[PDB]
Amino acid sequence: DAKVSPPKRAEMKTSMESLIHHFKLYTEGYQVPPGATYTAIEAPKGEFGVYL
Amino acid sequence: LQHHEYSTYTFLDLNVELSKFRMPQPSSGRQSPRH
Amino acid sequence: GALFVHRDTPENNPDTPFDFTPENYKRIEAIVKNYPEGHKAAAVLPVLDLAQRQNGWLPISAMNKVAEILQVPPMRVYEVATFYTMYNRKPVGKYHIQVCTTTPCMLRNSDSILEAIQKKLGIKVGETTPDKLFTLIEVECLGACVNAPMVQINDNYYEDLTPKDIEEIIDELKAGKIPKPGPRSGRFSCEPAGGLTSLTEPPKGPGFGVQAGL
Amino acid sequence: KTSFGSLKDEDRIFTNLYGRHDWRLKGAQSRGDWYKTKEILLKGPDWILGEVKTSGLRGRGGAGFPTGLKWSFMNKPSDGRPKYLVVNADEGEPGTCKDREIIRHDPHKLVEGCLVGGRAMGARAAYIYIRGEFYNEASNLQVAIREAYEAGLIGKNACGSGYDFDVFVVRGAGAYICGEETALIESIEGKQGKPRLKPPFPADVGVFGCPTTVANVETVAVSPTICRRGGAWFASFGRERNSGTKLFNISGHVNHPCTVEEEMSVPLKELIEKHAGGVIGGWDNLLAVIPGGSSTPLIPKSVCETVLMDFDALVQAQTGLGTAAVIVMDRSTDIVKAIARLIEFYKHESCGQCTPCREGVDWMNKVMARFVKGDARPAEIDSLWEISKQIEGHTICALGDGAAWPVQGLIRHFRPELEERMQQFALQH
Amino acid sequence: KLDITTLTGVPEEHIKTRKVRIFVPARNNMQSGVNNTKKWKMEFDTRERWENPLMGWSSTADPLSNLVLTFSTKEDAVAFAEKNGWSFDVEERKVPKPKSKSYGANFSWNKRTRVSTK
Amino acid sequence: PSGEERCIACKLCEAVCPAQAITIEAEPRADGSRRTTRYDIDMTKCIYCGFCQEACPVDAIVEGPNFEFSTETHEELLYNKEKLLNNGDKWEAEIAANIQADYLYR
Amino acid sequence: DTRPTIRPRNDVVHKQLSAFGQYVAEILPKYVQQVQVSCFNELEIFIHPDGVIPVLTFLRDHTNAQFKSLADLTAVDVPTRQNRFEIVYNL
Amino acid sequence: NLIEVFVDGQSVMVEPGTTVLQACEKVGMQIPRFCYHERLSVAGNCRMCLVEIEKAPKVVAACAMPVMKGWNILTNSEKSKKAREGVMEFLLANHPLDCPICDQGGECDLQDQSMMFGSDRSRFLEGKRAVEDKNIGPLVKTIMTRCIQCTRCIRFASEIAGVDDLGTTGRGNDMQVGTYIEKMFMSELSGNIIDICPVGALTSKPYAFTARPWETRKTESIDVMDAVGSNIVVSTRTGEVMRILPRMHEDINEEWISDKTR
Ligand SMILES: Cc1cc2nc3c(=O)[nH]c(=O)nc-3n(C[C@H](O)[C@H](O)[C@H](O)COP(=O)(O)O)c2cc1C
Ligand code: SF4
Ligand code: SF4
Ligand code: SF4
Ligand code: SF4
Ligand code: FES
């Protein structure tokens, strides 16, 4: 999904759509839909959570 | 087979001859709407 | 193949001598009288056609003169001259050979006619003869797509062509002659090649089939 | 009636298609033209519109819109602006040469049709927009109009009916897009031949900003005969909702290419094999036929075997009637090359105004050239289909549809040939 | 009235000398998008930005030079400015007028709206 | 390879830098090309993330292989455009070789 | 939608969380103001600030709600509200 | 007089003659657009504003199509999404890969609308076109390879500036915007063709290459060059005025500023 993850440099230097998205993702970035979440994982030191 | 009597100005000459038959044109109210 | 930007040249500059003859001015007057008052800008195409028909091609000075006469911005005349194909913005030869290469023509082996023209004149498509007598250019269906390969030289249609026929036409043109326009196979019109399948009976006449009273 | 496709010469509207008689006023009057024209105009616009509606006449330009209601769209009280009738004589569709014959050999019929149509729509005058390449035809039309003016048929007090009407001929300049009604109006107004966006429709805002109706040469020329001989007589020919006598142009790989005024809903095989001597090499050598010029998708021999040449029958056959220009291609034809040439024609004859048209037509031209060379991949056929679908329906004019439809027809009916040619190109390298 | 100024910890120089502006940001003229012109914003007054001697970087001694608070309505922004004792300056929101646009006017018969090119 | 700088002053390497270590100023050069007049990166603020080399569309800014460049003073770590250009010319052979070895994964 | 790019959605957990939110709202209507279930299966209960101790003690001790672990306790500053500080409890 | 139309089902009362785009703007939906400008005549050629009307088989152009009572406008329907993606793909088919070097970068309508409504990759395997640059003056830097033929500059000149010098020459894929002759677009309002142009085809020569939009700080101020008191935005970066942009004030300067002010 080139609107979240940057395209390959080979695609970026050959594709107009890829260059636009590469330009935007590294200047503004991807917009995240409004909302909140608490995602936690089993980190080596215990539960590591992020309330984004 | 009468098409080989037509010169370059044949079409326009016939248009000139019809200017008398044509009736007066209408008017938008100005010389050109750019005015 | 052509350029749609104008670069000033000694033979094509805003100061290049051009002006309509008084008879051409009368024709322009009639053309303007055709269209309603307040919309004399509608005459850009016919006036440009007249300018090209008089001069042979369309220098920038011709476009400026047309704009001045019709009191329209010169850029509008430039747009009109660049949009359409029949307006020659560069000087052309005496005879403008235009060959239809669209599918209907292509099926009837129009490429043979094009090859014959190239072999005879010795110029490729788009080139002008060294003596400035003929110009070769391929075009689209000229509205006679049922009449075998067809070339338009100036205002005349030459249809139902064969390579030998096109060679003969070119020879006649180069030898100061007026080749007969129309089909060159034997037929007079879009009728079937051998034998009329319709309209064999004489016309009925006036008043035939008049319904009731009208 | 059950079986159609055999018209009698007594019923043919155009009795001088081949130019075997006089094309001047004397010949036209001897052939029935201009008879009781004063009474037709004195009947009233409503009567003329009713006759056109009863005739079941549909547009011969290619759209096939009901002519009667289209013309009655202009039948409104005057709003202080003049009304005009515009005749579409551009004839730029490849394979279409029917209007050329009408103008060249039957010009007075067109003038009488212009007068009748203008009376029906209350039009002040008639601007005939003839193709720029048609110069001799324009000269013939001008001579016919001059004769009509001299006889008093048109002009002030036309045919003594008390109706004032003028006929103008405006030559083209070499643009196929000017065949489009709104593009033709723009060309008449003196601008670039770029089609307008609807609404406003020409019936409300048209040429010079006045109510207008654009109509094909055949659609206008058949009107006096419809009014005289009757709407029922005109409707008597052809299937229901596909009624009338149609001009057909039979080009391509046929023994005797010609143009004949057959009856609507005529079988395609009967039309080809009777008036043109069949396909070159027999009907068993027919690869595909484009029924309606270039904008209509092709149909293979299987479809051509049993199909009627009318609007509805061809619509069901995944194609269209269009201008009834029957392009015939034998089995020695490189069908991909022919379709690529048509797409190149649309590329060279694109107004370049709408983004889908301007970009996608050239894109499809490049893709079709690579297909002709075989320099592509099998996965690109579906991509080209999607490109054609994006072009179709998303443009201003119907030239986008007219350029997408040939590609869609080719992909639908000959995809194995494309894939086989791609395989050939891949193997060779 | 809320006088949280003594609790925010802001030094006196940045409470009284400041001049907060409350406004809806104007649309970036380079773009036709209007999504940014929907929420009220609060910014302080621009102050000195001298040149760093070593590198030429633009130095500053204004801690509030980058504060841009976004509010849903004007009243909330005014209340928040009053809470912290900041001299606010409200600018009324400007909304583009409803404009009568007609494509048919491009081909007018007796009006100047008739365009010469498309 | 021609010898000219790849940096065309698109400034997205500065925009992506999470530490805001890159400072870029550009003007139309005498030839009219997009060339930076100032390209300053403070190695004392950089987090050595690589986001700069990953954002550059012309492979101009590139974190090279050198890691032993410790200085006795703080000021030496505030790199100029001249410092970076000089660095690039010194490590080019190795930087190129590394790009050639790794660019297929990028 | 489907296919690898999209994130799969689990309706079962959504239904269970909605049911449990209704359960909590019914048991504690004095403090619960709003109940939401996000599309990624996270349950939120909105409580009047006086209901901190009652609702949390219920969610810790109730046999049908044994949230015995306080995952997180944070605040969100939204200066556009009368009550700018929004205290969030993660159990 | 107010007729009733629906935008995504929601009712809204609009005046007769209102366009689909304005009806959608009333409820808060900003339909993507390139050719349409509020202060210019409706063109309808970019085709980006295509939207699906419920129960209708064809997608209308919201920038030009006037609403009819009872219409339900499906702004986010699948037909609208596919139309927008196809139009964006066609626009980006021949567009040059100049984003890093284009001064419109970061504030480009084509980029943002590709990010929001267009696809994320290209199927265009062919070679892009190239257009010779046209010199139209010492202020507007012209890189015509980026032009998307939206005809905003032509309409702006011909209507707001009265200078009928800009226009389209040729047809098809070869159509080129700009004066046919080597002429200078001399006007006191010529600077606004830089702002109206969505792509970086027309760019400010003095502002060329100097800064990127995301880093500039915007200060809203008032012009003092003349007595009109035009509202302007002073775009500063690191304590230095980088450019001056117009600020919308319907009662003073609408959306334009003079060349001196700019
Ligand atoms: C690309 C294009 C080319 C067209 N060419 C012609 C033409 O050559 N002759 C014609 O009568 N109609 C042509 N049309 C159709 C016209 O737009 C218009 O619908 C027609 O002239 C009126 O047909 P009718 O009044 O007989 O129904 C063309 C349409 C398009 C989109
Ligand atoms: S180093 Fe690369 S990314 Fe940074 S400004 Fe130069 S070209 Fe752009
Ligand atoms: S590695 Fe590059 S992007 Fe990362 S902090 Fe350092 S300069 Fe910035
Ligand atoms: S105009 Fe926009 S999309 Fe085109 S190159 Fe410039 S920044 Fe990129
Ligand atoms: S130069 Fe810019 S404003 Fe003018 S037509 Fe091209 S894209 Fe539109
Ligand atoms: S915004 Fe409507 S077609 Fe361009």
Q: Chain C residues within 8 A (CB-CB) of chain H?
A: 4-8, 14, 60, 73-76, 78-79, 82-83
Residue with the smallest CA separation from ligand 5 atom 7 is H147
User: Which of helix, strand or coil describes residue A32?
Assistant: coil
Q: Which of D247, D306, D304, D308 is nearest to D279 (CA)?
A: D304
Nearest ligand, CA H151: 5
Enumerate residues lining ligand 2, CB below 6 A.
F 7-13, 24, 55-56, 58, 60-61; H 100
Q: List, comma-separated, the residues after which chain D is broken, a break being a C to N distance over 2.5 A; otherwise answer none.
A: none
Using a 10 angstrom Cβ sphere, with 0-12 exposed, 13-18 middle and 19 or more buried, the burial of residue D297 is buried
Does B have 3 or more CB contacts under 8 Å with E? Answer: yes
Task: Tell me the C-alpha distance between H191 and H177, whole Å.
Answer: 17
Going from the C-alpha of D297 to that of each of B22, D280, D320, H58, the distances in angstroms are: 44, 21, 7, 20
Q: Which of H167, H63, H24 is nearest to D197 (CA)?
A: H63
Please name the residues in contact with H146: beta carbons below 8 A apart, sequence gap of 6 or more: H95, H96, H98, H102, H104, H199, H200, H201
Going from the C-alpha of D246 to that of each of D107, D211, E85, F7, the distances in angstroms are: 18, 28, 87, 68
Task: Tell me the C-alpha distance between G49 and D235, whole Å.
Answer: 83
Interface residue D223 vs chain H (CB under 8 A): no
List the single best residue of F20, F23, F76 to mutate versus E (max E Cβ within 10 A): F23
Å between H173 CA and nearest CA of chain D: 5
Going from the C-alpha of C32 to that of each of A47, C40, C205, the distances in angstroms are: 87, 6, 40
Q: How many CB pairs under 8 A join B and E?
A: 11
Burial annotation H205-217 (CB, 10 A radius, 16+ → b, else e): eebebbbbbebbb
Residue in G closest to A47 by C-alpha: G71
Enumerate residues lining ligand 6, CB below 6 A.
H 33-36, 44, 46-49, 61-64
Enumerate residues lining ligand 3, CB below 6 A.
F 16-19, 21-22, 41, 46-52, 63
Tokens of H111: 């980029």
> Is the CB of residue D77 less than 8 Å from the CB of residue D261?
no
DSSP-assigned beta bridge partners for residue D260? D248
Contacts of F103 in chain A (CB under 8 A): 9
Q: Which chains touch B (3 or more CB pairs under 8 A)?
A: C, D, E
Q: Which of D187, H220, D133, H160 is nearest to C76 (CA)?
A: D187
DSSP-assigned beta bridge partners for residue F42? F78
User: Which of helix, strand or coil describes residue D58?
Assistant: strand
Tokens of H14: 């609009």
DSSP of D237-305, one letter per residue?
A: SSSTTS-SEEEEEEEESBSS-EEEEEETTEEHHHHHHHHS-SBTT-GGGEEEEETTSSSSPPEEHHHHH
| Packing angle of the helix pair H109-117, H78-93 (nearest 10 deg) | 140
Task: Tell me the C-alpha distance between H100 and E46, whole Å.
Answer: 31
Three-class HEC string of C181-212: CEECCCCCCCCCCCCCCCCCCCCCCCCCCCCC
Interface residue E78 vs chain G (CB under 8 A): no
Contacts of A13 in chain F (CB under 8 A): 57
D91 lines ligand 1 (CB under 6 A): yes
User: Which of helix, strand or coil describes residue D328?
Assistant: strand
DSSP-assigned beta bridge partners for residue H203? H141
Task: Tell me the C-alpha distance between H6 and E15, whole Å.
Answer: 49
Amino acid (one-letter) located at H32: P
Å between A50 CA and nearest CA of chain G: 9
Using a 10 angstrom Cβ sphere, with 0-12 exposed, 13-18 middle and 19 or more buried, the burial of residue H246 is buried
Give the ligand 1 atom nearest the CA of D182.
17
Tokens of D141: 């039309």
Query: Ligand 1 centre and the CA of H171: distance in Å?
Result: 19
Enumerate residues lining ligand 4, CB below 6 A.
A 20; H 95-96, 98-99, 102, 104-105, 108, 110-111, 146, 199-200
Task: Tell me the C-alpha distance between B6 and C169, whole Å.
Answer: 19
Given in angstroms, what resolution was this structure solved at? 2.9
Q: Which of D295, D299, D382, D373 is nearest to D337 (CA)?
A: D373
Task: Tell me the C-alpha distance between A36 and E14, whole Å.
Answer: 34
List the single best residue of G17, G37, G72, G88 to mutate versus A (max A Cβ within 10 A): G72
β D245-252/D258-263 pair status: antiparallel
> Is the CB of residue D323 less than 8 Å from the CB of residue D334?
no
> Per the CB < 8 Å rule, is E108 touching B29?
no
Query: Ligand 6 centre and the CA of H15: distance in Å?
Result: 21
Contacts of B29 in chain E (CB under 8 A): 110
Going from the C-alpha of H184 to that of each of H131, H140, H201, the distances in angstroms are: 19, 10, 16
Going from the C-alpha of D348 to that of each of C31, D339, D403, D414, H172, the distances in angstroms are: 30, 14, 11, 25, 7
Give the ligand 2 atom nearest the CA of F8.
7
Q: How far apart are the first and last CA of chain D?
A: 59
Task: Tell me the C-alpha distance between H63 and A31, whole Å.
Answer: 27
User: Taking the CB of residue H238, how many other CB atoms lie within 10 A of it?
Assistant: 18
Burial annotation D182-221 (CB, 10 A radius, 16+ → b, else e): bbbbbbbbbbbbbbbbbebbbbbbbbbbbbbbbbbbbbbb
Up-side HSE of residue D185: CA atoms within 13 Å toward CB?
26
Is position H207 annotated in a ligand binding site? no
User: Which of helix, strand or coil describes residue H14?
Assistant: strand
Q: What are phi and psi of D187, to 5 degrees?
A: -65, -40
Contacts of E34 in chain H (CB under 8 A): 30
User: Which of helix, strand or coil describes residue D127?
Assistant: strand
Task: Tell me the C-alpha distance between F50 and F45, whole Å.
Answer: 13
Q: Chain H residues within 8 A (CB-CB) of chain D?
A: 42, 44-48, 50, 58-59, 61, 64-66, 82-83, 86-87, 89-91, 93-94, 123-126, 148-149, 168, 170-175
Amino acid (one-letter) located at D264: M
Taking phi over 0 as left and psi of -120 to 50 as alpha, with beta for the rest, E28 belongs to beta
Helices (H) and strands (E) in chain G, counts: 2, 4
Residue owning tokens 């098409």? B3
> Per the CB < 8 Å rule, is G71 touching A1?
no
Which residue positions of F form the known binding site for [4Fe-4S] cluster?
Answer: 7, 10, 13, 17, 39, 46, 49, 51-52, 56, 63
Task: Tell me the C-alpha distance between G88 and C203, whole Å.
Answer: 97
Task: Tell me the C-alpha distance between B26 and C146, whole Å.
Answer: 42
Tokens of A40: 């936690």
Amino acid (one-letter) located at H19: T
Burial annotation E10-38 (CB, 10 A radius, 16+ → b, else e): beeeeeeebebbbbbbbbbbbbbbeeebe
Query: Ligand 6 centre and the CA of H194: distance in Å?
Result: 19
Contacts of H209 in chain F (CB under 8 A): 9, 26-28, 34
Tokens of H152: 């905003």
Task: Tell me the C-alpha distance between A9 and C47, whole Å.
Answer: 55
Nearest ligand, CA E118: 5
Residue with the smallest CA separation from ligand 5 atom 2 is H197
Q: Which of C118, C140, C136 is nearest to C126 (CA)?
A: C136
List the single best residue of G69, G86, G90, G91 to mutate versus A (max A Cβ within 10 A): G90
Please name the residues in contact with C117: beta carbons below 8 A apart, sequence gap of 6 or more: C97, C99, C136, C151, C166, C170
Contacts of G79 in chain E (CB under 8 A): 69, 71, 76, 80
DSSP of H170-235, one letter per residue?
A: S-GGG-EES-SSS-----TTTTHHHHH-SSTTEEESTTTTT--TTTPEEEEEE--SSTT--EEEEE
Task: Tell me the C-alpha distance between D165 and D124, whole Å.
Answer: 6
Please name the residues in contact with D361: beta carbons below 8 A apart, sequence gap of 6 or more: D343, D346, D347, D350, D391, D399, D400, D403, H172, H173
Residue owning tokens 């080129």? H176
Contacts of C75 in chain E (CB under 8 A): 117
The residues in E 22-51 lying below 8 A from G, measured between CB atoms, are none
> Is the CB of residue H200 less than 8 Å from the CB of residue H102?
yes
β H3-7/D308-309 pair status: unpaired
